[model samples]
Target chain A: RSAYEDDIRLAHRLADVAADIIRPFFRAPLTIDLKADHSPVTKADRGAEQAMRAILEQERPEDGIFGESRPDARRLWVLDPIDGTRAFIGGRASFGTLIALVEDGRPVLGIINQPIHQERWVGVKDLPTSFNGEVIHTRSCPALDHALLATTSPWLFEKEGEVHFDKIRLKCRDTLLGGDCYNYGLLSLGHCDLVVEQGLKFYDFAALVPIVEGAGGIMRDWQNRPLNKNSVGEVIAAGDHHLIEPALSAMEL
Target chain B: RSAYEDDIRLAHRLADVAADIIRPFFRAPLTIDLKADHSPVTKADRGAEQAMRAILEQERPEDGIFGESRPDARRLWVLDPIDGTRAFIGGRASFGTLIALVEDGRPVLGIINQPIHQERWVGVKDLPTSFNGEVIHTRSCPALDHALLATTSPWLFEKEGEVHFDKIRLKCRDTLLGGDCYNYGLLSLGHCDLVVEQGLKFYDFAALVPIVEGAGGIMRDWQNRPLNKNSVGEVIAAGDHHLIEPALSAMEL
Candidate 1:
């Protein structure tokens, strides 16, 4: 068994509770609200995070949380209850609940769950990724011209980041926008060949690392380094290793 | 029954055959092809159109085709077999089949079907829209500030259209992009409150009119004029009548 198997099971439990909390809010009379100082969280978002946090609190009280952070803790749970709240608010199924277990700064267990569609992708370090219950892998990107790329929004990039993303886009076959973490799930399923983005928080991408890497894909920073909690937000994920250099070269300033 | 019930029935039939044709290709190892002068038509796109065309050929031979257009015919069938082929190619559910029947240059019956999701919206003149089999209405857009706006791309607009669209967007609560015709489907289901788009062709907006209008919304040329084959492509749709003038005012050149 993989060393992280126990944590993977715990991650799935967290995903389950979060999905139950989030499913009812989609397309219903959902209202958005701001917290004491933090802003732009919907009821589902807050509620899902709370649900997952509660589970970790009850079952694995020793683990620190990246969102509810502890500086000295060696192990952490990263959570973004709703990866695309805007898509959720607009009644799109592209929103997902992100959960990850990080040990010593590396993600060891990851889950991306779409409650509306009832699709779940789980990836544990040292094991193959699975969609629902079956093994899944990313499709091949024979070349840049044959690649289908995904990004949440073209404007999400900073001015120079936009130039870099556009360089990759111009060489790509086509771009699919507006699926936040859902795009990563699609990439894991071999439905998409590349996902290039910038400005992602640790919570925004921690769960995605194992999910993409476990599915025969690679995730790296703009500088083509492995992603971790310490990395800056610039990110690129490609299904094929051979396409990575070409993509990296295109993005190099 | 409505006078165009027969045409509406025909449209649903057309949608079904096209859906059957397109369903298997999604998420599979599908290849996209381009025409000599026109690029980006897939085998599924061509096949779905052929399936629908075969139906129209057998059932309503006298109806002038708009896609495949008899300029002089009073009755026309508009078919855009797959609305977001890129979404289809990326294995997303946003792609849809668009079908419309126009009489005297105005759309009388329209159908938008998402084959992967098996959700269909049918709208006929003088009748309320139905999502699946139940009648559905657009959610009220109480104010521009409370509305949810949807557009496919921020870059699709010309410089001025972008300016006008941004005016509406800034006032709206959120913007959902990359849905293409699927956004209109959400608009009809009350999941989204407004859709603003520009530079659409006759085949593009023809099917959207009755679908949006039948759901208690109004679709007009950006000029606030009724849409028809005569329209010059700039278009805005609002769930509430109150939003139209304000959106129009914002988009005023």
Candidate 2:
């Protein structure tokens, strides 16, 4: 088999394996465990991460790994076993699992799978982004004044500089909040126009790059630069370039 | 039937009819009609509200009505024909129809229905709140640091006392943003524990009151007083009463 075709197979296979491993825990009563800061971490989150880690070791052992559950590595395979834990525990169907591949610090492949929502969004090298295998792209909404902005938290705006958020709000057509990792998938799928977020962990933002870029859109830190660890980036992602700069400028990022 | 039972049946019938009338317009190419400020509002929003108004007139005729589409009535029935229009247009299932019955100036019945999610959260006088007909209530996470607190808009936090929103963020276990009518429905089903918002019109908050209260929780303005139209009455709702006071106290209500 050609190496490129083998890679495609690996992507789909990893997706299926990850989906299968995560299902049982998601359907069960989520065990609410604690993180160092006393943040609640569900078994679903850790279990999914572990499942992905085990499979990566078995199937793609050559690749390095980074996850919310593990330390960073070069050429990392970033995973958020369960990106929307609050949504999952809340039993709302907005939660999902996010996995991405970063090649020498650049995200190149992203898979966002929403098992409960029965939606899978994937973006790989040189391949069109797909939603359930149907190629999708960002919205055509031209201006932030008429664009729809989606986010997962307001804490990004808290304690000060919420005005940065307000600036984005004033220019938007309307804003919807809180879908965690899943909203980026939706943005790539042409389901929404823009997504803005700040205070994201690497695991939170890393896996999204491939999905956003592959879908013919942009995903960047608040500075309108490619996402990286140093970018405590307020994310500004959109299909239409016209909207991105204005939105970034509004926040003066 | 007893008077309260009759009210329950009426609500069910009205909700069913409203759903029937509004369902067809969903996912249809929304005529991207714009508000004067240029924010998009679809025909679906107007169509849904029109259908609700028609049903209310035909069925109850006696009750007062209030909504975004109609602003004249007192002792009103507040309805968001389609709460997440962006979701509907994007073909996501998070969108739904919302209605609340306000009697003598208070929302005593709350109904949030989303056929797409196969989920229905409803609460009437003395009826246990349920999801898809099964009884449900709020989750009792131990602390704000571990609790899941959510909000619809950050700007909603701007008008209230500075502490109003900052405190909730400081205290909550975790926080998520966005969902509009969906968050309260989740709250009723015991998924999310806290939801607060600002600069809200009465119709926006009215439909949520019964659902929160019936789920064995509390819903009040920041002042710890009852909710009404005269006050944007900064909102703090939670399944745990402990969350209610501290959350509101965090607000400069």
Candidate 3:
């Protein structure tokens, strides 16, 4: 049995709480009150994060935090209660809640919860990923040319990063655009094969590594190293372990 | 009642058939066979179109067709059985079936159906748009800088069009990507403020004009001309009618 299963379970519980806090604001999207009543998205983000923090405080009192509220402790939790605030504001289903438990600066457990579709993904290091209580795995896509790739948007890429992404994008069989954290979730579930992204933060992607790795895939920063809380924002995940080399090569300038 | 009410009803029927035909293949996307077994997307596209065609032949044999197969008759039915096949293939909900009825080169009836979400929009000239059988209207955003905008992808935009799309995208409150016909459907439901797209075909957008206009929005080609089946592919739709001139001006070369 995995040592982090309870942490994974707690992550799931935090996600459920965050989802509950966030769902109601989305139904009335126009309530986004540019800081007066507080933008609906901001309220949702703060409320969900606050709700998760309270629960975490009770469950793991010694764990430090690194989210809207970040700190340092032997064990730390990262929270981005709303991963795609723009999507949530615009009523797109690509938004979700992201949660991670970091131990010694490495995420040992992660959770991605998209409340709208009622999809929850939980990942524990060295264990398989679970989606809505069912284990799911990434699909094999050995050939870079036959791969179906995805990214949130190329606009999110830096000037140099865009060139790197385009190289891989050009070689992939086809590309699907517009899913932030959801793209990695789809990668973990085998709905798509590869995802390369840039301009993420610690909370933005910490929850994703375990989820992607736990699903039999490989995820690393553009430098071709495994990801942790202290990695660069440019990241790539491939469903098949074999694609990592070529994927990194294609992105090589 | 609108003269095209019956036509709108028929379009909805066609959408149901196409959605049914398309849904089954997406569950097995790796089934995409380059040319041997026929790409799964191709099979889904063809099967859905053929099913719609068969029904249309039985419902209105004399009408012309303009989709995978185009023709001209006093009354022409245009069909894009799967408007965002890539999204369908990628297990994203940003896809749908588009149907329109044109007379004298102008669309008078339209339907945008997303079977996965079970959301259906029906629009007939001179009447309000309906979502799930209930009347809907677009939300107003008079200020360009405060508006939310959507488009399928910048990659879909041509070199010149990307220049224009970016200008407006810069002015909008925020932007969303990767919703083909589904973006227009969202605009019709008062969910978003604007939609600007390029590289469209008659089948790609013929069904959208009525839906956007019927929901109290304005739609036109880049030249600010009302769209007909023959208009240039550059198109813009705004939830608030006042957004047209400035939106076009932002795209001014």
Among these predictions, the greatest TM-score belongs to 3
Candidate with the larger DockQ of 1 and 3: 1
Docking outcome class, model 1: medium
TM-score of chain A of each: 0.93, 0.86, 0.94
> How well is each residue in B194-242 modelled by candidate 3, as lDDT tens digits?
8999888899888888888999999888888878878868899999988
Tell me, by lDDT, which candidate is best: 3
Backbone clash count, each prediction separately: 0, 15, 0
Clash pairs, model 3 backbone: none
Regions of model 1 farther than 4 Å from truth: A30-41, A69-71, B31-41, B69-71
Docking class of 3: medium
lDDT, candidate 3, equals 0.85
The DockQ of predicted model 1 stands at 0.60
* Best-to-worst ranking by TM-score: 3, 1, 2
DockQ of each: 0.60, 0.41, 0.59
Cα-based lDDT at residue B23, candidate 2: 70
Q: Is candidate 2 or candidate 3 better by TM-score?
A: 3
| Candidate 1 residue pairs that clash | none
